[PDB]
């Protein structure tokens, strides 16, 4: 099947290398989850047992605002940025590290307590917050994360600018 054995690669001088066995089972690869946004979680049986959870069609996640230390659950609304390609953005495909808009309703009671990050408060006054996925959807069947702040927030807002 799919394999990640190195024997099919060349050496560090460019020479074709020979073939001295047939494919081993312990070097198998599988196809990837390609987790669509918006509820299935398949089970995969790995080497020696070891249930692996493999997601398709996630809708919600647990999101943490760290500097204020408030966590709520929320509905992922849209994937907006991704460092690899525009294709995974255009398809709303949930992979680790992508940046999404989450529902604002859960975090609207934090709109009371002042002396907080106004760049988070004015965005809560709207109807979404910007966050990053921290989990691996295709390995553990879950998409949780944290809300952006710091230089990183400004970096992604400028990437999202109306250019």
Partner RNA sequence: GGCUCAGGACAACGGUUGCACCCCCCGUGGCGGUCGCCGGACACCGCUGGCAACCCGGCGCCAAGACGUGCGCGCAAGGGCGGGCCCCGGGCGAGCAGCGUGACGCAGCGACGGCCCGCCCGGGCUUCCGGGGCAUCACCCGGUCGGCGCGGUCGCGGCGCGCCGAGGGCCCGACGCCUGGCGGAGAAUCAGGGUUCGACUCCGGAGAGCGGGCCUGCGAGACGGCCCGCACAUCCAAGGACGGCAGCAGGCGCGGAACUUGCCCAAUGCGCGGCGCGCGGCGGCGCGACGGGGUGCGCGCGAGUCAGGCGGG
Least Cβ distance, residue 20 to RNA (angstroms): 4
Task: Tell me how far apart the alpha carbons of residues 65 and 110 are, in angstroms, rounded to a whole number.
Answer: 10
- What backbone phi and psi angles, to 5 degrees, belong to 47? -65, 120
Report CA-CA distances (Å) from 149 to 77, 94, 129, 146: 19, 21, 11, 9
Which of 31/115 has CB closer to K ion?
Answer: 31
* Binders of K ion in range 8-67 (CB under 5 A): 22-26, 28
Stretch that binds K ion, among 3-11, 46-54, 69-77, 115-123 (CB under 5 A): 3-11
Task: Tell me how far apart the alpha carbons of residues 30 and 46 are, in angstroms, rounded to a whole number.
Answer: 11
* Binders of RNA in range 93-152 (CB under 7 A): 95-97, 134-140, 142, 144-146
Which of 41/121 has CB closer to RNA?
Answer: 41
Which candidate, 82, 85, 87, 86, places its Cα nearest to that of 100? 82
* Binders of RNA in range 62-81 (CB under 7 A): 62-64, 66, 69-73
The residue within the footprint of RNA, chosen from 4, 125, 158, 163 (CB under 7 A), is 4
CA 155 to chain CA centroid, nearest Å: 18
**Which residues of this protein are in contact with K ion, per CB under 5 A?**
1, 3, 22-26, 28
């Amino acid at each position: 099947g799919i394999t990640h054995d190195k024997m099919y690669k060349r050496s560090k001088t460019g020479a074709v290398q020979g073939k001295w066995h047939k494919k081993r089972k312990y070097n198998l690869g599988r196809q990837p989850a390609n987790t669509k946004l918006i509820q299935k979680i398949s089970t995969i049986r790995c080497r020696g047992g070891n249930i692996k959870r493999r997601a398709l069609r996630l809708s919600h996640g647990s999101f943490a605002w760290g500097s204020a230390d408030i966590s709520h659950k929320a509905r992922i609304l849209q994937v907006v940025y991704n460092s690899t390609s525009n294709e995974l953005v255009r398809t709303n495909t949930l992979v680790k590290g992508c940046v999404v808009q989450i529902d604002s309703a859960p975090f609207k009671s934090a709109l009371s307590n002042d002396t907080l990050d106004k760049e988070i408060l004015d965005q809560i006054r709207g109807d979404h917050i910007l966050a990053r996925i921290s989990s691996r959807p295709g390995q553990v069947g879950t998409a949780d994360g944290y809300i952006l702040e710091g230089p990183e927030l400004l970096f992604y807002q400028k990437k999202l600018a109306p250019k």
